[PDB]
Every structure is written in C-alpha cells, then in structure tokens.
C-alpha cells in the first residue's frame, strides 16, 4: 500500500511506510521485487534521480537471480551508471534481465 504524495512550494515528496508514517526519498529502504515490477514506469521516474545523485539506497529482495560480469582496467576511470539504468528500465511486470 505505498502511496506517493507530491510536494508543494519546496516541500519534499513523500511515500508511505508500513507503520503509517510518510517519509522522504533518502535512507535505507527495503523493497520486495514485485512492488517495483507492478509500478515500473512510475517508480523509475520518481526515484532514479535520487538514486543517481542523492543519498537513497534500496534493497531489492529477489531470492535467486542470474548475473553478468563486466571487467575493467583499474588504472582508469570507470562508471557503472549506464548498465544499472538499463537494468532498472528494462524491468516489466512479467520479466527481468540479468
């Protein structure tokens, strides 16, 4: 029963906890996978900026999953945002990628 309420005149937007309290988009959250699956587009458009630059960290409960490995040269700059953005955006109600 998570419900997002928008912010007004500079007030931060909020989402509802299980306890009934409404919290802003920064902290340690626990999600089950299905919640992101069934609200994919809305959740992306709300949370991706705050995950990319803000201080939001989310734990997704998956159980078992496949994986892919990408290697890199440690002596040079490396950033993993493109791969993770693609993975997040390719989540649909019925399927996920590696």
């Amino acid at each position: 029963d998570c419900r997002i309420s928008f912010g007004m005149n500079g007030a931060a937007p909020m989402i509802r906890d299980e306890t009934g309290l409404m919290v802003p988009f920064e902290g340690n959250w626990i999600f089950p996978l299905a919640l992101w699956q069934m609200n994919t587009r809305y959740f992306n458009q709300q949370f991706d900026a705050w995950i990319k630059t803000g201080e939001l960290r989310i734990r997704i409960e998956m159980g078992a999953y496949p994986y892919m490995l990408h290697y890199y040269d440690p002596r040079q700059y490396a950033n993993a945002w493109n791969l993770t953005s693609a993975w997040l955006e390719e989540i649909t109600p019925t399927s996920i990628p590696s």
Partner: protein, 417 residues
C-alpha cells in the same frame, strides 16, 4: 478592531539557551529566505493517509515549534534600543533587509564578534519598531504569524482555539456563501483561509471574520459530538469517515429538516488539548492557525490570568484580570464522549462504538511510543553536545497523559447550543 500589537517569545525547556541550533535553523528555510510564508509552518499532505515524518522534523508540531523557536531567537535583534537590523547575529543568522525580507548567513565581519545573548519569555510591542509603526500593511502581514506564535507560547500545553456561538452574525447573505463550501474537507478550508488572510487588511465585523468564526464553531461543535447528521446547526455539519483513526478526514455536509434550536445571545470560550497527541494531528494546528489569523484583525476577549503561568500574565492584548478561562481536554476521552452522544441519539450502535474504541486505544499507544523514543533521542543528543543543545519537539511530561478536565470542557462546549 485590534489596536494593541504585543507578542511573547518562547521560553527555555530547561536548557541554557534557545532550543534551536544552526543545522535545524538552516533546514527550515525550504520555501525561501522569508520566515513569513505559510508553507514554512504548515505541510500539505493532500491525503488522509497522513503522518508525515523526517529525521529532523518528526511531526507537524515539531515543525511548528521549531519555527516558533527560530522567530523567538531572531526577532530579539531589531528590538534593541539602538534598533539596528543586521549588526549582530543570532546563531550566525542576520536580517537581510530593514523590512525583514529574509534571513541570511552573517557577513565575515559579523562572525568575528560574539553573538547575541538571548533571554527567554520576552514580551515585545510591534509599535516600537518604526517601520512596523509606519506601514499598517506590513504590521498586518507580520502579525498574522506573530499571533499564532503567541498562542503556542502562552502555556505549556497545546495550542489554543476560540469557539463562538451567536445567531446575530448570520445576518445577510452569509448562508449562501457558506453553502458554497459544501463537499470540502476542513483542511482545505482552513489552509485556503489562512493563505488568503494576508492579502489585504479586513474589517472586524466583515464577512471574512464571520466566515472564519462560523467555520471554527461548526468544526468544534461537530468534533465534541453535539452536532451530527440528525441534529444540525442550520443544516450544516461535519462528517468523519472513520473516527479514532490515525489521520481523520472531516467533510462539510448538508442535511434537511433536523435543525437544532439555538438560544439568542452571544457566547464564546477558549479550548486547547493537553496530551502530546496534538503533535500528531493536523486539524488542531489548523484550528489554532485560523484563530491566530482571526486575532490579527479583531479583538477577542481576554484570557483570565489564572489559567497561565506568571510569565504570561497581564499581557495587554491577550490576558486580563477578568475574562474567559482555558478549557483543556484529552483526545482519547473525547473520542469516547463523541461515541456516547452519537450512540445515545440513535445514529450509532454499540458494536460500531466498540470498533471506534479499539481504534482509538491502539492509535494512542502507537503515538505515545513514538513520542517517547524521539524524546529519549533528543536527551542523548543534548548530553553528547553541550554547546548546541536543542529540542525537536515541545517538552512534555508523563502526568500530561492523564484525563484532566475533559468532561468539564465537553459540558462547556455543549452548553453553547
């Protein structure tokens, strides 16, 4: 018409200084540099789901109290005999313009020298500051917030609200302009009226004042449980979707052919909550803010000195020797009294009442646990940091969780009709 403009600042909660620090003060300025905008005080959740929280602002009452502390600290700067606006700092904050347009970080030259040594429980007059004397519109827009600050700061309990019953303020076409409000929640009406109040000065007996008074009286009368669907005040009442829940939604409603008989004459009273649950609901803070907006324009009857501690006694525009006493109530007992009246009149059965009581009990316990945990965290932080003591919420005590004087207030409210 009000002609005396006095306000009183907050007192310390056992600490050595104002209960705010730099981090909290800078975290407040979300809508801009001005502490005068309404959004600095109130939060628009827009849902009945409710119960907003944060790391530094656990509750709505927390935000209201922190804003009160910030204003109490900052306003003591221009109010010195010299009357200069930005020559000294309070917690590295400075007034940025003579008309108090906003707060900024102090200049480096100011930061070199020691800050202002604030003292608590001060009573100040707006007419002493010359720019407030010269411009009635400026005095109007600032007193809109100063009056609500005083209503919070007068006593150690929750905020005060004013309820009036009178059949003479219904004259004219006010009935139609009230019927225009059907279907809106109390939060919507209160927020919009409070926002509108600052636009221009208004008349003491005008339509706006009588509108606000009627809205306040209807809300409180329906809240106590006197006015309901089968006993209405000129066909108006407030319907609650589910009483006793964590965040309640009250909706203005019309019912035909159940109008109650109202005696002639004008009467009023002052009511307030005493349990810490006032931190957790939004309706009571909205009622207090409407009362403050009304006070900024019109002169209300004085509060008796017996109801307030000696620091709040003999304030020229707020308290006096003869007047109305304050009626303090406790939330969970008021739920039972509401259910009692409704079930006695036949609107409610016994099983529905039992369901309401279960909800009220568990809600009260949950809120009490959260408030106690936050208070413990505050005390530990104060022990760890002796130079930056603070309180996120107005202090409370265990004995305040009692039933004191609830039934007396319920009878006093019922006597108005």
């Amino acid at each position: 018409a009000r002609a005396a403009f006095l306000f009183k600042t907050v007192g310390f909660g056992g600490l050595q200084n104002v209960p705010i620090n730099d981090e909290l003060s800078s975290h407040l300025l979300r809508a801009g540099n001005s502490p005068w905008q309404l959004t600095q005080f109130l939060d628009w959740i827009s849902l009945g789901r409710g119960l907003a929280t944060s790391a530094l602002v656990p509750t709505a009452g927390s935000r209201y109290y922190q804003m009160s502390c910030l204003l109490s600290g900052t306003l003591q700067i221009p109010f010195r005999p010299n009357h200069r606006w930005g020559d000294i700092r309070f917690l590295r904050l400075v007034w940025s313009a003579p008309t108090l347009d906003g707060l900024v970080v102090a200049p480096p030259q100011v930061l070199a020298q020691p800050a202002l040594q604030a003292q608590a429980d001060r009573v100040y007059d707006c007419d002493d500051y010359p720019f407030l004397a010269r411009d009635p519109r400026f005095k109007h827009r600032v007193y809109q917030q100063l009056s609500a600050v005083t209503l919070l700061n007068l006593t150690g309990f929750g905020p005060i609200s004013y309820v009036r019953v009178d059949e003479d303020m219904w004259s004219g076409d006010v009935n139609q302009l009230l019927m225009n409000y059907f279907g809106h929640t109390f939060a919507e009406i209160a927020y919009t009226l409070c926002q509108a109040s600052a636009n221009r000065p208004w008349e003491y007996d005008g339509t706006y004042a009588r509108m606000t008074q009627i809205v306040l009286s209807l809300f409180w009368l329906s809240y106590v449980g006197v006015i309901h669907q089968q006993n209405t005040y000129r066909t108006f009442y407030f319907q609650c979707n589910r009483r006793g829940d964590a965040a309640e939604v009250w909706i203005l409603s019309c019912s035909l052919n159940h109008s109650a008989q109202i005696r002639p004459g004008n009467r009023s009273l002052f009511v307030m909550p005493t349990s810490p649950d006032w931190n957790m609901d939004v309706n009571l803070i909205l009622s207090s803010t409407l009362t403050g907006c009304l006070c900024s324009g019109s002169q209300l009857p004085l509060i008796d000195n017996n109801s307030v501690p000696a620091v709040s006694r003999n304030i020229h525009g707020w308290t006096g020797r003869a007047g109305n006493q304050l009626h303090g109530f406790q939330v969970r007992r008021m739920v039972t009294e509401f259910c009692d009246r409704l079930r006695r009149d036949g609107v409610m059965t016994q099983a529905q009442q039992n369901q309401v009581e279960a909800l009220a009990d568990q809600t009260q316990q949950f809120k009490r646990d959260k408030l106690e945990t936050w208070a413990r965290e505050d005390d530990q932080y104060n022990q760890a940091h002796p130079n930056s003591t603070m309180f996120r919420t107005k202090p409370f005590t265990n004995a305040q969780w009692g039933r004191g004087n609830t039934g007396a207030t319920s009878a006093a409210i019922a006597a108005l009709i």
